[PDB]
Design a protein around this ligand. Structure first.
Ligand SMILES: [NH3+]CCCCC(=O)O
Ligand SMILES: [NH3+]CCCCC(=O)O
Lengths: 360, 360
């Protein structure tokens, strides 16, 4: 089987790397507002439906091409999604919208064993995102892999709290703490990036884009071989878990110092080593349209002792080095602006290894 | 100025479209043999000096007339070369020969800014090809355009390796790789179709008909405003670059999957999107006297989002459509036999736009 990955660290053999091409600024709708920083709301308000700045995109393309070159150098087979113009307006019986991009494979695809799963998504501008990945997936299917598409939401108004009282990131954090998110429990929805793998145990967080119905779907679909656990954090990122709690080896995890896990003791009890990375050094003037500055810890492990890390983030490079982990430095400063780091920009399709339990 | 074109994609306003009339099969000399497939060598050997099959030419005329109709429909002003009998034998102090045709304006004329340049050519049967275009060029000159004629070669025996060891297309590919071509460096020579424009940067390839002296001439003549770069490919077409590396927009290029560019990383580093088109579907029984089957990617851009493409080549039509580029389908299956696709059969005289750099 070409597809086979049970965790985030076994020796990487094949990966899908995203594309920056024709990326479109999403229309400024409620769910977009609930997942971005106030600083950019007016950018979305004005640029909505237009391409992201083309000079910026060009730099991102260059950065990602180099990353792919380095992966091939590290012995990894790289697959890329198909080029597509994301500006096309589409219309379902429930809504109308333009697209986003196919920059982040981690947001939509998750590999559990020999099974590739397409996440439903929760943003209207990402409804047809799966189209960029179908050529690769059909190939794996022909070659023997299992293929699953979680139930695609209608994304009708009922899935969103149109009056979600968010006016600042501080409000959202408060609401989030009260169990209030922009997405209701009308129908299942989720981004695959809210799930992180550790063999037989998979950890998920209810976020602005992933609801309890969505997590339950994953839970019910993967049982009994896999167990899906729900964990929560203080002042969580509106979406995605990989820059909050990135598992980098058997029993080792990177815990974002600003977003402590409410269930950290479950991990301490299992004898897991919780590492808190140093703060990011990325300039506050650099645009991060989506995401926080914590992309620095959004690393991708080529294996247990080899990590692809940002060339600019020296302080976290040193941390890995004192731990005896070889750092493969790559610069994706401009690609970062699109919303992701190495883990987000990829989807590990095949890692050499077996299914195990690390929670014991 | 009626003449003004800095690249291959700005909004087209005026174009010169070739003619199939009185096309003559070139005498089978060494340079003709080095630029054609073994399958047709005996055709040239027998038909040399006679007109190409007249029933075939008639079909080509019909196809090109329709193309012109569609261009006028798309708002483009079309100029056509003068009708001429190419069978006339001429004689310079260096050689004697019959002509070819004025089917491919791209082979002989290149527009750089407000300047129209007549290529010297490298085939003895194309020595007097410029005669079909003089009425149009003098008109543009009277109207203000700059007019240049690169040094016309003597085309004496010294320009050719009379004993060029080509017996199959596989031999040529090997020789080409060794830096051995049918044309020596005796005097400058080139076809304008070996040059492709991207604003301040122009790319050229040393081919069977374009030597280093010829490229240097262009380089020296256009400096300092324009930079002429030499790029090479694996298993290149004996002549012309436009069905190997066709630039279709700012930072976007079509790279023939069978002829990868040795310098592709220069482009990846600039943040250019390299698209590899699907394979041609043209029947192997259809005669392609000159050219390979890759005419499918020899498209002409009416603007960045409008491309004139072959009606029969559905797979490449789909590629453009997923990229959000409107396809203007036209059938030139029979015209193709003469050696070209849309880019070859035309010469963009005026595109609306300015001189820019896209390599940064
Ligand atoms: N998938 C990438 C988004 C990560 C955003 C953050 O945690 O700041
Ligand atoms: N000027 C048209 C010749 C193109 C031939 C080829 O590249 O197969």
């Amino acid at each position: 089987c070409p597809v086979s990955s049970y965790n985030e660290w076994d020796p990487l053999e094949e990966v899908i790397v995203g594309r920056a091409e024709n990326a479109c600024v999403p229309p400024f709708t409620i769910e977009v507002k609930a997942n971005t920083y106030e600083k950019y709301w007016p950018f979305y308000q004005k640029q909505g439906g237009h391409y992201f700045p083309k000079d910026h995109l060009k730099k991102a393309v260059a950065e990602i091409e180099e990353m792919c070159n380095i992966l091939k150098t590290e012995g990894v087979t790289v697959r890329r999604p198909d080029p597509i113009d994301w500006s096309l307006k589409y219309k379902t019986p429930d809504f109308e919208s333009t697209g986003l991009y196919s920059a982040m494979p981690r947001d939509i695809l998750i590999v559990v064993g020999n099974e590739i799963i397409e996440a439903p998504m929760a943003w209207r501008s990402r409804f047809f995102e799966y189209r960029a990945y179908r050529s690769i997936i059909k190939d794996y299917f022909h070659r023997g892999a299992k293929w699953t598409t979680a139930p695609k939401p209608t994304m009708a108004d009922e899935l969103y709290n149109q009056d979600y009282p968010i006016h600042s990131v501080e409000d959202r954090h408060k609401l989030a703490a009260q169990g209030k998110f922009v997405t209701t429990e009308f129908e299942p929805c989720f981004d695959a990036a809210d799930f992180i793998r550790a063999g037989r145990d998979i950890f998920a967080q209810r976020s602005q884009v992933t609801n309890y119905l969505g997590i339950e779907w994953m839970r019910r679909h993967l049982a009994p071989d896999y167990r899906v656990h729900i964990i929560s954090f203080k002042d969580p990122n509106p979406m995605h878990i990989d820059a909050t709690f990135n598992i980098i080896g058997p029993g080792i995890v990177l815990s974002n110092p600003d977003r402590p896990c409410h269930q950290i003791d479950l991990f301490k009890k299992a004898g897991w080593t919780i590492i808190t990375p140093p703060t990011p050094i990325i300039p506050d003037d650099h645009p991060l349209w989506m995401s926080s500055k914590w992309l620095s810890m959004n690393v991708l492990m080529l294996d247990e002792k080899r990590v692809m890390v940002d060339a600019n983030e020296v302080p976290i490079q040193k941390m890995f080095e004192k731990l005896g982990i070889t750092t493969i430095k790559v610069n994706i400063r401009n690609a970062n602006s699109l919303g992701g780091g190495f883990h987000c920009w990829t989807c590990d399709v095949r890692r050499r290894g077996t299914l195990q339990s690390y929670l014991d």
